[PDB]
Amino acid sequence: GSHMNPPPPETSNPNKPKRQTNQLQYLLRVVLKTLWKHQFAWPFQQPVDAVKLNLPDYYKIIKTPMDMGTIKKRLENNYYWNAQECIQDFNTMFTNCYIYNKPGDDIVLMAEALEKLFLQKINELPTEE
Numbered sequence: 001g002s003h004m005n006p007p008p009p010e011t012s013n014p015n016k017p018k019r020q021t022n023q024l025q026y027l028l029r030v031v032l033k034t035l036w037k038h039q040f041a042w043p044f045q046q047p048v049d050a051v052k053l054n055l056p057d058y059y060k061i062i063k064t065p066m067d068m069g070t071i072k073k074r075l076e077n078n079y080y081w082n083a084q085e086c087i088q089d090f091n092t093m094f095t096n097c098y099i100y101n102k103p104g105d106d107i108v109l110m111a112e113a114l115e116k117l118f119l120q121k122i123n124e125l126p127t128e129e
């Protein structure tokens with residue numbers, strides 16, 4: 001893509017420690033799966049392309065971008081050590097949306113729908129075994 005967009009967040013790095021946990025499996029099989037197929041998921045399924053969207057200030061405002069395409073790759077390629085790292089990525093994605101956009105904007109109502117589902121599923125994150 002455009003040189004004016006930053007590289008996406010890291011999804012592969014042999015130096016980073018990684019482990020499978022039952023909680024991370026739940027985050028893939030339940031949480032990501034639930035959110036990915038929601039009617040309002042599509043704006044969140046890949047990094048923001050600030051050039052295509054004509055948002056030249058996006059990556060000036062949002063210095064820790066995150067999206068569900070990145071999270072999906074991190075889960076499927078076993079990038080994480082623990083569930084907290086992945087939950088933080090989802091929280092970062094929502095908070096970026098809420099910081100960049102006006103309350104009540106369509107993109108914010110879409111994010112809020114996904115976050116409500118997220119919260120319900122994370123309240124049920126299984127005990128680590």
Ligand SMILES: CC(=O)Nc1ccc(Br)cc1
Nearest residue numbers: 043048053097100101107
């Ligand atoms: C994820 C996100 O904020 N995307 C986005 C989409 C459209 C506009 Br307009 C602003 C931002």
